[PDB]
Amino acid sequence: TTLTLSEAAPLLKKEFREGRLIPFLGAGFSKPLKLPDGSQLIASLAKTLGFEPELFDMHGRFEQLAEFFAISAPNRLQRLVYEMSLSFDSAEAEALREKSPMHRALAALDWRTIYTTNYDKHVEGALRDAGKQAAVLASFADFQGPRARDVCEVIKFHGTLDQPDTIVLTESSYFQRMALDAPPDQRLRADLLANSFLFIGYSFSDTNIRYIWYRMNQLREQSQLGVKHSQARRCFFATHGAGLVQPDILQQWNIDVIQLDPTDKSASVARLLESIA
Amino acid sequence: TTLTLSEAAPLLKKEFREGRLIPFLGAGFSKPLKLPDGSQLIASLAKTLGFEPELFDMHGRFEQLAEFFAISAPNRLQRLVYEMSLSFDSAEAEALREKSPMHRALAALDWRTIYTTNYDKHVEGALRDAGKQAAVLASFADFQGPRARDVCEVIKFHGTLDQPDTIVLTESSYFQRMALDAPPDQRLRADLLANSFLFIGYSFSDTNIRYIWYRMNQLREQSQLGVKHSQARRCFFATHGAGLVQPDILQQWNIDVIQLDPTDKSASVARLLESIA
Amino acid sequence: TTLTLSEAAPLLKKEFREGRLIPFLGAGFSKPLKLPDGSQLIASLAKTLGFEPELFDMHGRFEQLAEFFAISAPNRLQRLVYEMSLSFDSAEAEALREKSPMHRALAALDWRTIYTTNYDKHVEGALRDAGKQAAVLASFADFQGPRARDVCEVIKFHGTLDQPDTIVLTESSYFQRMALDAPPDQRLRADLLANSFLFIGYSFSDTNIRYIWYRMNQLREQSQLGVKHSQARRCFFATHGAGLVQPDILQQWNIDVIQLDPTDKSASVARLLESIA
Amino acid sequence: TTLTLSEAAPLLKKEFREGRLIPFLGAGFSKPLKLPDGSQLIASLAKTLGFEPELFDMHGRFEQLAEFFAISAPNRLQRLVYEMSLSFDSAEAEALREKSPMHRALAALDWRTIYTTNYDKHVEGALRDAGKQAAVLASFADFQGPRARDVCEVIKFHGTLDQPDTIVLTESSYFQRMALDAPPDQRLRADLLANSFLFIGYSFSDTNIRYIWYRMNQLREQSQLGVKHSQARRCFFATHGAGLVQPDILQQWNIDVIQLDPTDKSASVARLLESIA
Amino acid sequence: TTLTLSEAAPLLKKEFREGRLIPFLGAGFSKPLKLPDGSQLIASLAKTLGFEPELFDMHGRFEQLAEFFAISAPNRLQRLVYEMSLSFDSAEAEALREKSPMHRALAALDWRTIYTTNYDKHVEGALRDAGKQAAVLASFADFQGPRARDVCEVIKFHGTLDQPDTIVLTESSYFQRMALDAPPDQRLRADLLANSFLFIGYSFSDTNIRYIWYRMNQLREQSQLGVKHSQARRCFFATHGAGLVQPDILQQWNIDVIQLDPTDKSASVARLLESIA
Amino acid sequence: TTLTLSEAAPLLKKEFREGRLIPFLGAGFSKPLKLPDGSQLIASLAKTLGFEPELFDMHGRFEQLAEFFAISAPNRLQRLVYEMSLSFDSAEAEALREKSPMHRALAALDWRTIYTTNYDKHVEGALRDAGKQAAVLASFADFQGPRARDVCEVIKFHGTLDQPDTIVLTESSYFQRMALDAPPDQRLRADLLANSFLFIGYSFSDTNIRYIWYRMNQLREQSQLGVKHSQARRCFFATHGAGLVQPDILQQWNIDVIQLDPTDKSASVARLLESIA
Amino acid sequence: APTWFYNTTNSEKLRELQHVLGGSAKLGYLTAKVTEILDVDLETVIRAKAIAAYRAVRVPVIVEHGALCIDALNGLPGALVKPFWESLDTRLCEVIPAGQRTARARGALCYCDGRERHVLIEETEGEIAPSARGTGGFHWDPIFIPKGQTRTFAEMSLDEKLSFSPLGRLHTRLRTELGL
Numbered sequence A, B, C, D, E, F: 001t002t003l004t005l006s007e008a009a010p011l012l013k014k015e016f017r018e019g020r021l022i023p024f025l026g027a028g029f030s031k032p033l034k035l036p037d038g039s040q041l042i043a044s045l046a047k048t049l050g051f052e053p054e055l056f057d058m059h060g061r062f063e064q065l066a067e068f069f070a071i072s073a074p075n076r077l078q079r080l081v082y083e084m085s086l087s088f089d090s091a092e093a094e095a096l097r098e099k100s101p102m103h104r105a106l107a108a109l110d111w112r113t114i115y116t117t118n119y120d121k122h123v124e125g126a127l128r129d130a131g132k133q134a135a136v137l138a139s140f141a142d143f144q145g146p147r148a149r150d151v152c153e154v155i156k157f158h159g160t161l162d163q164p165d166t167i168v169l170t171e172s173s174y175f176q177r178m179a180l181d182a183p184p185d186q187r188l189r190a191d192l193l194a195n196s197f198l199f200i201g202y203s204f205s206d207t208n209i210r211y212i213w214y215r216m217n218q219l220r221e222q223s224q225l226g227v228k229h230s231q232a233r234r235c236f237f238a239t240h241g242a243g244l245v246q247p248d249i250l251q252q253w254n255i256d257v258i259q260l261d262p263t264d265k266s267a268s269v270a271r272l273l274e275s276i277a
Numbered sequence G: 001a002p003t004w005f006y007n008t009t010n011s012e013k014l015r016e017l018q019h020v021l022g023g024s025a026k027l028g029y030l031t032a033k034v035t036e037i038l039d040v041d042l043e044t045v046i047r048a049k050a051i052a053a054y055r056a057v058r059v060p061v062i063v064e065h066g067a068l069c070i071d072a073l074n075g076l077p078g079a080l081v082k083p084f085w086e087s088l089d090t091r092l093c094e095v096i097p098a099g100q101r102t103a104r105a106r107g108a109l110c111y112c113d114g115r116e117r118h119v120l121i122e123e124t125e126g127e128i129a130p131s132a133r134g135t136g137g138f139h140w141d142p143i144f145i146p147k148g149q150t151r152t153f154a155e156m157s158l159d160e161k162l163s164f165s166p167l168g169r170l171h172t173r174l175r176t177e178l179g180l
């Protein structure tokens, strides 16, 4: 009911040599850089507001606690971006990034499009470390700006720290992305029409990501394809610790789960990215 | 920062005598009828699937555990509706409903529209107990069907048990309502343009209810009203146990919190509905 | 107020050598193949219905007269597609297509994406004549189907005759495309975020094409770019006979008009496509 | 014609024990923290634009070269603030700041108001290092925000990096401050009515600072005080390398020059701040 | 729509214990000292000019009738200041000032700044009666003069009788203060950035006071704060007899009205100043 | 990115025949009369003060070195005006002015208003040479003085040598003009509301000229005109040697640059003024 | 309506706190059942008990937990006193050697408003009785004799027990810090 690493490796080679495999990188991909995930941010927002971090967690979800933070005082969200810039893109996080085996194995492949939902320059920065060049696309001005001819386009799906208007963190910013009208939303839905995705270090907790894969099946089911042909183009979900409910929800959306070895999280991902080559 | 019962009582009389107050009833309004809330359903779905009820709860949210239930076997959702009908609308739940002080105090007022998100005939059934007559509107055929002239229209916002296609319980049914295209969605957004609402026994956990009040502020903020005039039409949220984060999120959406006495939940609601008269 | 051919030629070379120019081909591009435009179809639908072709034209617009045709009798639209297939893709239209100077000049360039709104295999057929290979993408199954690595993708925006469910001709099919949810709609809106377009043989009479360029400015104006930077990425509209109102409407949407010589329509287009090389 | 360190020391003790001495700190005060001054920023802006740093310097003044940078591309100023935040407020600039003798000698005194024109948290950060607490005031929301009772207010006169809308760097932002209507402008002109200032590490090159001291003399000369009484309240300008023209311009504005020893710039400033105690 | 005395008392205690409450005293604060208000001056100017006091009142406003008085003859304004000195600061007005309950309750609090618009030494004289010491600041030479360390600064906003050049009474002197360039104007606009004010005995009839609170909202509205945060810092307007129009004009400028009991004007003010302690 | 002479010639004919073109003449317009520019004055001020002219230049800007000159001794500025009058308006500068092709081509056109920033009678003197009559307006008494009916008004924007109080040369005189309250300032800002200007021989180095064009855009941007209509009324900047930064700063202010041939400066200007006719 | 809620399932603790803090109209009463963590430290258990009771009742809550640290058992039970009196009822007087009967009766209140947890701790020196005596009171009151006194908590009335017990000093500290 779940692919292993050796089973999923010839399936990922076929989609990569055809140029139809696109990585989707989450907050767990920057975990070996000693960065906060979605839980250590809330522990830092609770310290500023005067909450204990265990009491602040039980008043709402991740989107709702950041919405409460941003309206506590004026200019409270601007300060968070400034602080995150200092801690996510610091020089010691740069130094952990050249010697990271996941970021080396990611940049060794010749991708054309990479999607990320984390606010740090460590996915395009991994491509600059390997001598390659990348193109960060986050806002409308980036898509219409000049690029080079054949350069890997890194789509910052949730925003970048150097453009603080593009960061979606609060609940009102997730509701603004439910219209699927932002330039990262329109680019994602067109790439999903034709490409397989590889989710690495990401857990489907964002209700706007799950809503995009929902509405691709409304195109898939209305097109009245067979049992054989509607199940042909799959997406892949590499996860150490998926539960018992979530892999069966995603089978509806043509998403297969690749079970990685949970003893060493960083080496299991790196062996997956080296098996694509 | 929070209205009491005596403070909110003249504010609710003014909106009721103008005919611009509409109740919105949740799952906590049927709690004195000994019915399951959103947690005792999941304890019953876990027993059917072979889970322990505490282990089944930590694999996903309420929408996602019901999505996992409905795809476990064919016709598994149809059986749930049948079981819920026999338990929610049973004869002993009818007998607890005439002697309930909340349902008597609700039906004593001369409402014109009532919205509910629970699957039971105990809100329109409370109106039949007081000699009044109600009109259940759940699907497209109900809105175009014949009614009488001046009859309280009970809008089953999430569906009714006698029309099992209208029940939204699973995650895919909540995503289908994100388009705001269903007949209860279109009727709600037009009533929200002109009326104050009174949330009784409901907690804002549905991401499609919160998204409707989100997009009413996008009309409110784009209309460029003043500080005084954009804050004039309020909605009211009667809750015994609102936390510390959620009342400040809802102040954005012109929703005021009415703190009820948590020692006796049923008598606190009944004194609120009697203060409107 | 309007570019000439020699003025627009260095502007089209710059966008083509960067790989950011995409042709958009209309019904006037298949006019030298002796095919009907939008007016000779209505003259053929009026003959079947028993109308005089001048009396049938004054009862509605092009979308509405085809909607009236399709509901006159059962299977009346299926017959039209069959008749169009025999007339549009006939062998004598193939023979006029190798010796056409526009189709030779189009296929001489190394495009990557071509959009068309006409129902004929004469744009991808022009690429097969030059030894190149093309990939027709019209439905959801085409986008998820297998292609080769670097092949010009011809996006049949309004449908193809070999897939009769994809043809949008009647008014109800244009209203179904107003949701911008079809796979050619989602691919167009993502290519418009990053690329200049060249409209050849097309007149903006479709209210779903004009609505897509409308909503790209709602992204452009909300992004609050300057006067200089919001006017940088232009689109180009080659037309022999644009009026006095329509070029000023399209200046709002960053669409520049290239005035071609109306004495010989086919040679003026061919000199434009040869100036890009 | 110029005060020495021992001559100016009893003049600074008298104004400090009366509570009427306010420091004004410039870009040279953060020079021992290995930060750029106004010339190494322009060397960094020229590298991004593709200029040689000596050729870029001769096309305009400091305000005008930053105005040219900010309009070269969209979001070009936002990136600069992000880069400056990671370079100015880095952890190795924090570590040089505790062992800096100027920042220790500044925080040893019990000031009430400090003005700075540099974008770094190293003046209020020096007060946090000495156990004291500071209050950064940069925007309108900071002045109306809550503070404590007796806390040194650090007025970021040109803006702060955690509030990027307050940074005045380009020429258009200096012209916007010529109206003297910003909250740091209004607070400065009222403190100048009653207090002596001590300029440390600042050179009068900003035409909005010089315009404020200009218009204080228009109040001083119109009040028709004597020769003795109009020259009583002085301001002090500690500078290693003032030229031959600028000290005589500032004598008009009751600004006296304190000549510091130019052999060691950091130790000369530290002996001045220790002589006030 | 209007605060009472018991409602406004905890709001004034909070701003006073933080040191952010500043009294603003008008001509009605010296009414129990048997002094003229703005109407009995005009009755005295009409007697000198040979007018009947009811006929002189209907030829212009208060500013314009004093402008007509000052240009009737040479040295006519100097005589008025001399006459006012004899009647406002007389010994029998001193004797009514120690036994006045408002002036005792004002001096019992430990203020730091007091603004007045009346020409009499009965606000700083009330502080000398309670053993405290005050510092009158009216002109440019007073702001740069020597004071003590922690002494309540009484800002004579419209001038003092011992400095007759500072008195603004005529229309030309109000127009000279529209530039907001005088030393009491610059000190007021900087204190308004950070402090709540308490208007006692003053009615907003001066068009230069109303223009200062106008231009503080132009800073407040351009800073784009929320509905919650732009309404946080309030000012207070204690008045026995405010009409129906003026309290709603001042709600725009964050000025709340405290309704005092109009039966005894002196005792209602004294209970307000004792409730702050 | 820069107009040539033949491109800008039909644009200047259209504004001239409508009477909406006004010349703005700088110090480079009197360069063929062998007069000092802004650099040879400073070489003459350094000789009087005892400086070497290369050492005097590096102690401040042009405004600041003249401020240092004027306060070196009493009556030092008056002597400079007397010396300038003898050198600028000498008889041999008159004789070079009739045979100058620029001054003949300027006076051949029928202007109505001419602005100059140089202290010499060679712009109105050029009009007297062509038989026309001019009206010099420099001070308040000139604007209210008698003129004839239809006579070209020459606005000496920085002053005239026959009225030495109107000359703005020192830094304190430029700061006095920052209020934009002088009669040449008020006349310029009203002519800029309705007219195109032609800058000939002037380089934007005066921070009060640049501040006037700054604040015309604050009226232009607040009026919320479109992209098309806010860019309609242009100003023109004829310059042989504009750099790389300054033409892009002035595009913000609707100022277009006309590149003249730098081999012969006098003949390039004369061909521009003859192309307007 | 109350603003603070004292949560206990023990109906004997309820009548003690209503004997002194009963007339306060700002204090309500709830009966939610929580599960304590396994630790002998009183400060650790009472702090984890308030976060587990706020999660149940979702109002500003006040919880209470005690300790009976004994010198002969090196501090045992500590905050593990609830399963000792269940297991060893009056044999707890017998498992402790005669001659080193000294012990501390500790008690802690922790109030949680939803954002902060503040712990108030009082403490009473004493010694375990040689045998259980007295009828009043409740759990382990017949075995504890305070220092100086000869009688147990069970032998004394409710006014006299609260002049020795840790709760009699915790009434005034809870009333002052909460304004009850």
Ligand SMILES: O=c1nc[nH]c2c1ncn2[C@H]1C[C@H](O)[C@@H](COP(=O)(O)OP(=O)(O)OP(=O)(O)O)O1
Residues within 6 Å of the ligand: G007, G008, G009, G010, G013, G032, G033, G034, G064, G065, G066, G081, G082, G085, G107, G137, G138, G139, G140, G141, G165, G167
């Ligand atoms: O001052 C006291 N005087 C006499 N006995 C006491 C006291 N304080 C606690 N005790 C007893 C009661 C219980 O048997 C055990 C504490 O355990 P404890 O968890 O707090 O009791 P519980 O679970 O039944 O009620 P609650 O829900 O308030 O925790 O020691």
Ligand SMILES: NC(=O)c1cccnc1
Residues within 6 Å of the ligand: A027, A030, A035, A036, A037, A038, A041, A088, A117, A118, A119, A120
């Ligand atoms: N940049 C990151 O690693 C990150 C972590 C958590 C949330 N968003 C971003």
Ligand SMILES: NC(=O)c1cccnc1
Residues within 6 Å of the ligand: B027, B030, B035, B036, B037, B038, B041, B088, B117, B118, B119, B120
């Ligand atoms: N009918 C109900 O009371 C109910 C409860 C919980 C969820 N849905 C319905």
Ligand SMILES: NC(=O)c1cccnc1
Residues within 6 Å of the ligand: C027, C030, C035, C036, C037, C038, C041, C088, C117, C118, C119, C120
């Ligand atoms: N295939 C075509 O040329 C065509 C013409 C008119 C309308 N649709 C298609």
Ligand SMILES: NC(=O)c1cccnc1
Residues within 6 Å of the ligand: D027, D030, D035, D036, D037, D038, D041, D088, D117, D118, D119, D120
């Ligand atoms: N804060 C700084 O170091 C700085 C440097 C240069 C210009 N402005 C600020």
Ligand SMILES: NC(=O)c1cccnc1
Residues within 6 Å of the ligand: E027, E030, E035, E036, E037, E038, E041, E088, E117, E118, E119, E120
């Ligand atoms: N000193 C006063 O009472 C007074 C009265 C009227 C006007 N100005 C001052």
Ligand SMILES: NC(=O)c1cccnc1
Residues within 6 Å of the ligand: F027, F030, F035, F036, F037, F038, F041, F088, F117, F118, F119, F120
């Ligand atoms: N009169 C002039 O030409 C002149 C020259 C230099 C500076 N100012 C004026």
Ligand SMILES: [Zn+2]
Residues within 6 Å of the ligand: G034, G036, G082
């Ligand atoms: Zn317990």
